Amino acid sequence: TRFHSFSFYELKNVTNNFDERPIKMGEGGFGVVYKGYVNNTTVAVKKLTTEELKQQFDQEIKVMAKCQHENLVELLGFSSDGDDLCLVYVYMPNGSLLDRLSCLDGTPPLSWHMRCKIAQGAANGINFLHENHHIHRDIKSANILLDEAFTAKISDFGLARASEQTVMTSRIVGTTAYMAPEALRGEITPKSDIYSFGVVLLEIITGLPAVDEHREPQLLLDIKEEIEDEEKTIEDYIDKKMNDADSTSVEAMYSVASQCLHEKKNKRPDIKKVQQLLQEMTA
Numbered sequence: 249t250r251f252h253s254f255s256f257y258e259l260k261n262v263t264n265n266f267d268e269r270p271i272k273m274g275e276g277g278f279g280v281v282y283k284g285y286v287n288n289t290t291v292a293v294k295k296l297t298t299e300e301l302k303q304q305f306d307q308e309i310k311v312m313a314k315c316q317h318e319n320l321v322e323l324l325g326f327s328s329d330g331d332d333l334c335l336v337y338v339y340m341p342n343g344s345l346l347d348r349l350s351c352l353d354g355t356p357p358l359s360w361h362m363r364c365k366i367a368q369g370a371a372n373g374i375n376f377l378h379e380n381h382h383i384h385r386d387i388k389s390a391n392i393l394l395d396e397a398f399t400a401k402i403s404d405f406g407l408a409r410a411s412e413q414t415v416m417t418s419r420i421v422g423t424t425a426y427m428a429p430e431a432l433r434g435e436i437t438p439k440s441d442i443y444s445f446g447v448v449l450l451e452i453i454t455g456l457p458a459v460d461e462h463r464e465p466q467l468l469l470d471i472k473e474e475i476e477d478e479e480k481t482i483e484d485y486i487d488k489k490m491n492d493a494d495s496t497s498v499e500a501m502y503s504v505a506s507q508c509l510h511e512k513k514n515k516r517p518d519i520k521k522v523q524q525l526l527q528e529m530t531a
């Protein structure tokens with residue numbers, strides 16, 4: 249795919265001079281996102297070492313040219329005009345799954361029905377990336393965007409890798425609270441995306457963030473051991489901000505999350521198996 253090359257000044261004009269006040273959108277993928285209106289459509293404009301930051305910008309565009317799917321955010325264009333690089337996307341009115349699970353800014357809690365659809369859509373997006381020999385490397389709820397219908401859209405391909413076993417790297421990247429043991433040691437494999445997706449499934453079931461410094465356990469992945477040692481059950485961790493969650497489908501989602509979170513990469517299910525299991529949960 250070939251994208252529209254936007255003018256930096258057109259992007260600066262439509263985003264009100266890249267205003268940092270709320271409604272700015274968010275920040276994380278080594279850049280800040282801003283709202284704007286261009287060519288009769290609402291858009292999201294990402295304003296991004298200087299050389300390492302350009303590699304993140306080129307990688308997003310390369311992966312986006314090759315990867316187009318109902319469950320991946322669509323890139324509309326970009327801006328190279330100067331040295332303050334901008335990426336232009338289709339605007340996702342419902343934000344991230346992280347913000348929606350936390351009910352940030354007073355939004356209503358997501359229902360179990362909406363959560364199951366989001367889990368399936370996110371898994372369909374990761375399946376498409378793996379089928380096309382791509383490793384995301386930063387699967388997390390902040391990187392799952394939600395559109396006008398709450399359809400899951402995988403975002404942020406700056407750290408993504410092609411594969412077109414297992415390779416190793418010297419610059420270990422990702423989000424600690426979601427990373428597989430092998431990814432924290434420098435391995436690059438699609439099995440690490442499965443593990444991180446298992447952490448996303450625990451956030452969906454519980455509504456709790458992957459890490460919370462004022463909590464025990466501080467890391468959400470540790471509830472897997474508390475449940476396996478029969479100290480607690482998944483029912484003690486279910487998000488109470490839902491009225492439509494039945495124990496059978498919650499346990500079926502938890503079983504997928506548990507399998508995803510296997511400490512040995514070769515014992516985890518592949519994305520096609522995760523996708524099959526999530527489809528059978530609803531059906």
Ligand SMILES: CNCCCCc1c(-c2cc(C)cc(C)c2)cnc2ccc(-c3cncc(O)c3)cc12
Pocket residue numbers: 272273274275277281291292294321337338339340341342343344347393402403404405
């Ligand atoms: C605190 N918000 C964090 C998530 C929001 C980020 C965000 C929102 C959004 C923003 C706010 C403030 C509120 C709502 C409801 C939607 C809307 N559209 C987006 C489109 C693309 C990317 C993107 C960014 N980087 C890389 C991509 O591939 C896509 C991010 C987007």
